[PDB]
Amino acid sequence: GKGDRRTRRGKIWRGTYGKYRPRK
Amino acid sequence: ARKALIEKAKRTPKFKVRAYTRCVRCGRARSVYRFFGLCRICLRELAHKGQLPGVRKASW
């Protein structure tokens, strides 16, 4: 789901953080 | 590396952001290494000459 920017995998791959993959 | 653009390169420009590097040698715009201020051609050349200090050829 690496294209899905609403997953941990999604942000993991885009190299970003958001709601769906936050820092700490 | 037309002459004017090597000079323009040095001209402190109207905005901080038109800052761009060229090769201190050939003037090449494109593959310029911060650290040497040289392009990947010149790097290669001077490296072999032995004129970049401590720059060995890698191998691992």
Added chain:
Amino acid sequence: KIRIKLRGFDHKTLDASAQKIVEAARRSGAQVSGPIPLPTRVRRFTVIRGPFKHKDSREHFELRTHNRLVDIINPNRKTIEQLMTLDLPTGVEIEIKTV
């Protein structure tokens, strides 16, 4: 009390210089933690070989800054008065911090 870092490109000269400092501190009255080999920071460069096209051949260059620590505990005066009289390799940088 006196701590010497040794950072240079060539590890022969770097290592040599540090022997000239382990002995300097002996013949002056002190004990020493030997020349400690700190890890070495490599800067690689990966240039396309040809000038035009041909991306599928490169050449790999590197830049190896080598690091040696040396400590002289129990630092006397006959020590310092044998250190600001040395200097023998060129491509070696010294930095001394009394910590």
Added chain:
Amino acid sequence: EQYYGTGRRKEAVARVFLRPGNGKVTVNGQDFNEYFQGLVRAVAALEPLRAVDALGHFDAYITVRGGGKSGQIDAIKLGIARALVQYNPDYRAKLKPLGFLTRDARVVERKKYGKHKARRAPQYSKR
């Protein structure tokens, strides 16, 4: 009182400390079976003992760092065998058959330029 053996495998380094007794084993401050929670391969790490029949006649204080847990497994597994011999030099005879003293030379291959992967060449397709 202890017997050591230093087992490494492919960017992993295992520190094996053997002390006779029950059979229990610590890696990095956890029970062996809790550290390798659901890893099948894990059991293999204690094959060096089982093949000399000293499982239970020992304990183990072990630490690993580096590699993946499996890499750590074959490193422990080495390290134990390395240790059974500092204890009993005659054990070599029993272990070398199945070659439990052998450092697996195999390791990840340098990515090479103009490949995608060290071997995986880029695709040539059509004309």
Added chain:
Amino acid sequence: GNKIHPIGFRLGITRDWESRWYAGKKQYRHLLLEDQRIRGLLEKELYSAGLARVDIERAADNVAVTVHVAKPGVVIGRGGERIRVLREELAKLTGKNVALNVQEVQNPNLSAPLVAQRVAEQIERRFAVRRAIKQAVQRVMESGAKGAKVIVSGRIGGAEQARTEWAAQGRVPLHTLRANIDYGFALARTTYGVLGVKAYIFLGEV
């Protein structure tokens, strides 16, 4: 697209660098360009003296430029004058305390960069190119050398058809790492165009 620069290959094993100093990422960029401005000038101003190497050792605000030259007087100058002029013009373009010393290349027949040059001149002065080479290689082996090789490439003679001449004696083992092999390159600039001279000199197994 063939052979590796015989120096950069041997570099660090059987051959040394022409600049020897340390510098962090901050300073390196410019001490480099500073060296290149030095070696830019001394190269122009000393072609008359036949110059092989320009060594640049460095401290802090200190530069030890060792210039390696065939005819060491020409560098010095009558009275001792010419050298002073350089040292000042150096410490001008550098803005540091330039320490220019001079070293007598005792035998130009075993200095590749010189052999190269001597040929290029000869080629510029319109000399016979084939002879020019055999006779250069000659002189090199005559003086100790264990192997030598010269390659002139370009519009040889007048020549619409740009070809390549070459010649060698002894062993010139470009693959053998422990082989001390001096390389030099000269560029001849001519009415018909430009030609390149490479000269390899095999000097000794280490």
Added chain:
Amino acid sequence: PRSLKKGVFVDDHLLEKVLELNAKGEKRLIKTWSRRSTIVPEMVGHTIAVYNGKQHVPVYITENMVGHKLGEFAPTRTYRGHG
């Protein structure tokens, strides 16, 4: 979009010409090159010829076209179809 801290961006020298045209109640054609300028409600009802790389084309500014930048109304490239 442009960060909200720094407001919107209009080139001072286009904003200039309009304020003079407003604070005098005059409706005379303007030409500029700064496509990159936002559209404050001050511009409304005016007519601005803007550069599209070749010429200045008139752009009558109505109400609903305020959030945008001028360049949106002079396309830069010419397209017909493929033949």
Added chain:
Amino acid sequence: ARIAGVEIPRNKRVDVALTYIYGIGKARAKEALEKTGINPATRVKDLTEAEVVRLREYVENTWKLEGELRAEVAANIKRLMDIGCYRGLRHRRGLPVRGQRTRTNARTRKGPRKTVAGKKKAPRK
């Protein structure tokens, strides 16, 4: 369970179920099941008749939804074309709008591929 106009499907957990309405995606749904205090995990056919009503209240009233939302998006593009702005033309000609390449791809915007003639390259045939 008739909410917002559409019968959301029973058998499927409520946290999912609501997605099938226009203006409800994953988040808006799970926000609605908090604000009305309902275990989302329970199936739709396992609801209080009045539990359902609470859900209908919130959902139908706060957010602009269904075909009523299709309205605003539609008349939003409509605005853009009527304005005569770039994004307008791109919408009109059925091209990409947020600035993609068109020399290849760009297919979802132009539908299936209307192949045409072409020439003989590079040497002869």
Added chain:
Amino acid sequence: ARRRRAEVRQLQPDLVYGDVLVTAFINKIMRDGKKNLAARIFYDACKIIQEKTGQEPLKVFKQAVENVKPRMEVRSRRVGGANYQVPMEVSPRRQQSLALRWLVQAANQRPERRAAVRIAHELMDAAEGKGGAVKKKEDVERMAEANRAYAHYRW
């Protein structure tokens, strides 16, 4: 392999039964080096087998291979007109290898939702003599003596 004959890889014995065949099968199950998941899909499938039959899964396994091992097959030869489909007997290893592959490949075909089951069932069915694991053995063996008219162009 042009200079030498390639030397078969020696596998590590299974971590529960010891049979190297177990492992060989496992590897063929796994993908993307996911060996742990594989073992689990194997050994859990044994549990279902040990459950729904009572006997020992190791042996239902070691039986389901004989019943997919093809005693001979068709290979390919081209003579002087075109390509006559030639028959030829199948080695020790090639049998064992074809079997494991086919077991898995057609186990993965079955309708069952979960992997461990799909293995368990095919590993059972075939162990008896039914299911498209054997029907792709009874297929390669079919053409073995259906084109035996061309069985004189041998190698």
Added chain:
RNA sequence: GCAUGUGGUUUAAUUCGAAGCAACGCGAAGAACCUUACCAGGCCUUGACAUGCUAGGGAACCCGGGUGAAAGCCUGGGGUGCC
């Protein structure tokens, strides 16, 4: 389906090279302006850079106004060092 390169076509311009393997995520290890070589428009002419030469006016240099999209164009004042 999307990312890039390319053929083509289109364009005021879509800068240029690469063209079977050995061109096509290749020169580009970083195209919004810059880069930038193309196009349109407004500008400069010993010139953005080198070494000079003949004739006159000037210390060098520093700050402000006008016009302008900017570039440029016109203009005001401070300043008199060294041999």
Added chain:
RNA sequence: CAACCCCCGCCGUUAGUUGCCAGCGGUUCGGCCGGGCACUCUAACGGGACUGCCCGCGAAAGCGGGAGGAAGGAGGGGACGACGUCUGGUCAGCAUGGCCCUUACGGCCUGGGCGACACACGUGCUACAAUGCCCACUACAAAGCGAUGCCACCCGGCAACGGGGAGCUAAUCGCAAAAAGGUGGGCCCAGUUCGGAUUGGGGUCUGCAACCCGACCCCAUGAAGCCGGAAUCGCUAGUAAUCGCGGAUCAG
């Protein structure tokens, strides 16, 4: 060709910090403190492998097989490209013969273009799902990079991020969460809790300036796609497949 050089695999000597924790003293349970360099490691010099030993075949070279050994017959990988071929590539890196322009083919700027789109190919990414997807909790790397920068920790904020602010010229401080894996729970074969294109809306950051043409965050939209025709590519072991991590260029 091989060899001399580099990296990896075993052991040695020298070396004990910013690394290390084996027995011991003290513990706020953090190797934290004492103390110690054993071990790990770091990184500079060295040893070790020769068909040397045994059996079988061979005039010989060498081949097959075994023993000891970390390693066995080039141990794995690197750097290293012969005389020449291609009138190969590049005058747009640089250099250079010759021809051409010189109030123009030179130079400055602002705007536009290199990003155009009936179409075609090349290389790749993400998928079409249950050996999967989502959410939570829980482990194990290496290599690099950073004092104009990396930014720990507190605060606001769904979040991008912003405000405050400690350490670090760095084996100390940081980037740094490694992801696959493990444990728990959800979904139950569905164009779906598969896929995440496209578009609407609202923000963030960089930058003089994000219309043409940036990335990022959040809400809503949730296209094609259910494993790919004729053809065709890669890889022979830590390889393929798979999973994350760093760097160069760089305001972005």
